Design a protein around this ligand. Structure first.
Ligand SMILES: CCc1ccncc1CNCCCCSC[C@H]1O[C@@H](n2ccc3c(N)ncnc32)[C@H](O)[C@@H]1O
Ligand SMILES: CCc1ccncc1CNCCCCSC[C@H]1O[C@@H](n2ccc3c(N)ncnc32)[C@H](O)[C@@H]1O
Lengths: 326, 328
């Protein structure tokens, strides 16, 4: 229902970097839309389907599982486009298209790209794509980089140490302190930061939406080896994402990087249980394993070590309970 | 819900409300004779804090019932506080568990926004199947207060939002057909924040639920009639709601107030705007009905009808306590 509120649709429609970038990607690639058949997966209010119609699309199937499909239908009648935009209420996995499409368009990106698991519906929809058909967005780049943030690490313990007291109104809470720390460290942090907390150049993990299958997103293994630019304590990994619309005329990027004006995706940070001392020139190696979970999110398993010392840390986070710290 | 209250962070958030936790402890300890050597039921005990207060008051036995995974953390604190002989955590819904015996007193903190939100009072009232005749409830009564308010800033903040949907060319697209649906959605949102008491245009009307007498089914449909003698002239933008609970013990009555004349709590106050404000004069009477109907989303469909009796000026709103506006 969350996406079923006009207020929620307004917040994303009003977001210029999101909505304006999609319009630019589509209108500046008019040859990928001029007289084509289009699928808009999770169209919400239908704004992306209108942009395709502005670019000259012959037919646009606009699929929406929420009751927003009803409001999208009103906008298409109201905009005199019932001949070119057909709104199909229901799940993209369960509806019927009358024909194969030239191009699929969607805004399925969650926090850290993968959160909400909508990329699975986007990829599922390629059963409707013509061989040599296009995907907008075409690729997603997930960037991860080690960060130092003593204050963000220490505040976990400030919060958890609420339980480390022998007489909260006469009650010894101290037996729960360990569980409270564990629960706080299992929360990915959604907020932004100064790029100078980054201790190494990002590693990039690329999903090619033309090639990737639905099941590819159930388990995402991101090996990393960071060459440390700075000496300090590594508190965790920072995550962001770019997507590219690779059209016939040009590639348009939507970036959520900390070097770009802040978006409503912010960036995501996952703390280590224990920070790792690295000197500039050291290598920090390990694996980030994203495992799709039953709460339309991911279990995040990180293991990392400073190769030169053998110092090792890990964390297990659930992207379903993020801490909005902004 | 059985997830949300399942987080230690959420338990810490609530325990850290000192007015909430301190008033509960004061109600129980200053009424220790209502607990001493008695059998207690704590409905939805979370971390177990009210069961500990009952144990401090000298309760012989306390059944602490909890549906969420928080039940396991409560059992850890009962062992670490050496009260295994006094507090018995019973995992599950108070509707579906068996207790070995009837209780002298039920305790709970089941109050949501506007008292009724989250519909936990139904489980609190259900629990009375376990209450001995001449058993007590803590809290014993809930007083819902409503008063008409004026707030032009608040009214316009919300029209500033809906008028997004009046645009006939948003990136070339005509949104105006949805203007009506947007206004209704935005004005369905109860506003959760505090305010200065000088925005109130009349003395509050009080609606009293007696938890000793009420039946679970009584909370499916709640009809609150009101008649305000207006003390100021101006635009009524809606009704402000708050609530007190009273712990009516054998030694004293202790009140927990979320009144705007009182220290702020995590309950704040709740305002239900009218789509069109009502002009009234000092001395006019503003009457009508707040009707609360229980929905499948563990909440209420709220209908408010209000009229200035002297003019026939009448206003409506439907409100969706499922989609509050947290303005604070
Ligand atoms: C906070 C991240 C963020 C930050 C900034 N700006 C935006 C965002 C959110 N980006 C989109 C994430 C993806 C969320 S779902 C997008 C749309 O798809 C619909 N749906 C859901 C399932 C489904 C299905 N199987 N078949 C068809 N439709 C389906 C939803 O009802 C919704 O309208
Ligand atoms: C901070 C004050 C505040 C301010 C603003 N708004 C809300 C609040 C919270 N006030 C309590 C509302 C009541 C929330 S539920 C309270 C506890 O009861 C548990 N449960 C739920 C159903 C149930 C059942 N059938 N049988 C036993 N247990 C049950 C929950 O798992 C939870 O631990």
């Amino acid at each position: 229902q969350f996406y079923g509120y006009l207020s929620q649709q307004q917040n994303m429609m009003q977001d210029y970097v999101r909505t304006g970038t999609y319009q630019r990607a589509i209108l500046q690639n008019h040859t990928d839309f001029k007289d084509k058949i289009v699928l808009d997966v999770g169209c919400g209010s239908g704004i992306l389907s209108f942009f395709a119609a502005q670019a000259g699309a012959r037919k646009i199937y606009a699929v929406e599982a929420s009751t927003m499909a009803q409001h999208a239908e009103v906008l298409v009648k109201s905009n005199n486009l019932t001949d070119r935009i057909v709104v199909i209420p229901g799940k993209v996995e369960e509806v019927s298209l009358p024909e194969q499409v030239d191009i699929i368009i969607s805004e399925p990106m969650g926090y850290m790209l993968f959160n909400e698991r909508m990329l699975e519906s986007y990829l599922h929809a390629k059963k409707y794509l013509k061989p040599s058909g296009n995907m907008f967005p075409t690729i997603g780049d997930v960037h991860l980089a080690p960060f130092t943030d003593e204050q963000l690490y220490m505040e976990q313990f400030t919060k958890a140490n609420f339980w480390y007291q022998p007489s909260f109104h006469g009650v010894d809470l101290s037996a729960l302190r360990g569980a409270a720390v564990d629960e706080y460290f299992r929360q990915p942090v959604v907020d932004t930061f100064d790029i100078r907390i980054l201790m190494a150049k990002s590693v990039k993990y690329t999903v090619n939406f033309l090639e990737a299958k639905e099941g590819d997103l159930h388990r995402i293994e991101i090996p990393f080896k960071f060459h440390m630019l700075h000496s300090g304590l590594v508190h965790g990994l920072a995550f962001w994402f770019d997507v590219a619309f690779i059209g016939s005329i040009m590639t348009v990027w939507l970036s959520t990087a900390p070097t770009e004006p802040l978006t409503h995706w912010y960036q995501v940070r996952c703390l280590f249980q224990s920070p790792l001392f690295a000197k500039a020139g050291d290598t920090l190696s390990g694996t980030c394993l994203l495992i799709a979970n039953k709460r339309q999110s991911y279990d995040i398993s990180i293991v990392a070590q400073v190769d030169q010392t053998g110092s090792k840390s890990s964390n297990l986070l659930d992207l379903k309970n993020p801490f909005f710290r902004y």
